[PDB]
């Protein structure tokens, strides 16, 4: 009963790709998000799991949360840089500890790999990630800046 | 009554680390920017350069301005998903004119590896590059959004 500790996200393995597209795949659409089916996500995972630029956190058990992590290299730095491409954990106080359990496991991995550095792309009307975030270490303007730091994108 | 009207730019190989090493240390002096040694930068690129992952395109001969993208994969796409990281051209006319050079480029090689998205994260500040990138097909919101999506770090 006291015997164990708070759990600790582990790491998603090739294994666990339809488990994983399932997760994705549910994620969206219970918020009315696009999503591939799960035949083409899992192969997809499939895929990504068995190498390191694409890393997946599993939180639970069986899983109710999830964080994806991309990495890559970037000219400034001696290793990677990491992108924290999803967090997704159900609303609720629940859903947030597991947030905030996946995201201290995410820094952890990528100092691991010697990374110095996690990004996020917010949605700015998203105000509960951004608290959430802005709680646990993360800013969006730099130290001598003036205002936030924006996220352009242009689809090919 | 030979020469094409407009210069295209080339990817920078492992024979241009040392340039792009002069010319990445010397803007950010330039414009007071902190900057490893171009021993360091020269010594990491040798290896970015012979590699997919971050690519270099040189415009001008001999080259004056530049752009790296970095590229990864995701979870939703089949393809690649690129960053513009930098685009270092000078102020003024000339430096515009290579600039949307070498993004129409960028564009152009972003697609060739099954790309279908650039990002950006661009200081909200910097009115000028905002004008830039928002002339060429960039957005900060999502079609159905309100306001900005916002760029967040945690160094680590
Ligand atoms: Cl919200």
Known sequence: DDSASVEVP?????????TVAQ????????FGA???????????LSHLLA????????????????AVL????????????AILDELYVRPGRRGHRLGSALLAASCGLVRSRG??????NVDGEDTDARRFYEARG?????????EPMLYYYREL
Chains 1, 2 share one sequence.
């Open 23 to 30: 997760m994705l795949h549910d994620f969206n659409t219970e």
């Open 34 to 44: 696009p999503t591939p089916g799960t035949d083409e996500l899992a192969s997809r």
């Open 51 to 66: 190498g390191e630029d694409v890393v997946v956190l599993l939180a639970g058990e069986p899983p109710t949360g999830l």
């Open 10 to 18: 582990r790491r998603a393995t090739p294994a666990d790709a339809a």
């Open 138 to 146: 993360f800013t969006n303007t730099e130290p001598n800046g003036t």
């Open 70 to 81: 991309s990495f890559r290299p970037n000219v400034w730095y001696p290793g990677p840089v």
């Open 115 to 120: 990374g110095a550095l996690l990004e996020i």
